[PDB]
Design a protein around this ligand. Structure first.
Ligand SMILES: C=C(c1ccccc1)[C@@]12CC[C@@H](O)[C@@H]1CC(CCCCCC)=C2c1ccccc1
Lengths: 11, 234
């Protein structure tokens, strides 16, 4: 789930 | 009096007017870009509305006490286990606070007549909405308040059903301390309602059941071609 990872990692 | 732990949970709550205003605006532009012959079905708007709610749920979790200490892989597993449960809990609490009977209140600030929604939602969603309304009525009769709401949010998020976690001890600890804080809070603030703590916890399996069946229905609708972040979580 690349999208969920991105929403948790993004600045 | 309020246990300090519950105060820490309250401090993590989002700015609800801002969350709702942002979602309202997103959906307004959505329909505006769409030409006369390509407007979104009501089921379609609900999917996008739920999609945008999930973005705000992820943002809330990310910044919350305890959750922000988990490694990203643990954070993902927790949210993948409870995303639909948090959606439904948020829906239920919105009806508890702002709900009139015969209408449904949406995260956009819109109030919609139940007869209108029930005409379009289909048997399965009508059934699940009806069960959710039964929980609304029960929670309303118990004087379900915001302190108890945030406790249940964290009990849903930090579920013992999630395995393969690196830091299961943290999840187990939050579950236990939030449970103990809720047990204490209900005693102090509602001493005459012996059944309140138990009635609150027994809603969690029911919301889980509604939420899991909601997921299964939406997965069917996706496979059927009737439906972003919502699809990813499914
Ligand atoms: C999980 C839902 C859903 C998602 C995709 C499509 C349809 C519903 C919700 C939960 C709150 C709102 O985001 C959603 C809207 C809503 C009530 C109105 C549905 C009308 C369909 C034409 C949801 C809901 C609430 C309780 C039980 C099941 C779904």
């Amino acid at each position: 789930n690349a999208l969920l990872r991105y929403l948790l990692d993004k600045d | 009096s309020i246990p300090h732990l519950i105060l820490e949970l309250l401090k993590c709550e989002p700015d609800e007017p801002q969350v709702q205003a942002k979602i309202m605006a997103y959906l307004q532009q959505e329909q505006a870009n769409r030409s006369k012959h390509e407007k979104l079905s009501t089921f379609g708007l609900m999917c996008k509305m739920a999609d945008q709610t999930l973005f705000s749920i992820v943002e809330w979790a990310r910044s919350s006490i305890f959750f922000r200490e988990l490694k990203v892989d643990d954070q993902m597993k927790l949210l993948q286990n409870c995303w639909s449960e948090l959606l439904i809990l948020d829906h239920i609490y919105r009806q508890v606070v702002h709900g009139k009977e015969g209408s449904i209140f949406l995260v956009t600030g819109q109030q919609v007549d139940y007869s209108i929604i029930a005409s379009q939602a289909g048997a399965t969603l009508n059934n699940l909405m009806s069960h959710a309304q039964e929980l609304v009525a029960k929670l309303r009769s118990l004087q379900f308040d915001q302190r108890e709401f945030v406790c249940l949010k964290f009990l849903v998020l930090f579920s013992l059903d999630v395995k393969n976690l690196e830091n299961f001890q943290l999840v187990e600890g939050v579950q236990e301390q939030v449970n103990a804080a809720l047990l204490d809070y209900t005693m102090c603030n509602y001493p005459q309602q012996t059944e309140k703590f138990g009635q609150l916890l027994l809603r969690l399996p029911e919301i889980r059941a509604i939420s899991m069946q909601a997921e299964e229905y939406l997965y069917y609708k996706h496979l059927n071609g009737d439906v972003n972040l919502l699809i990813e979580m499914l």
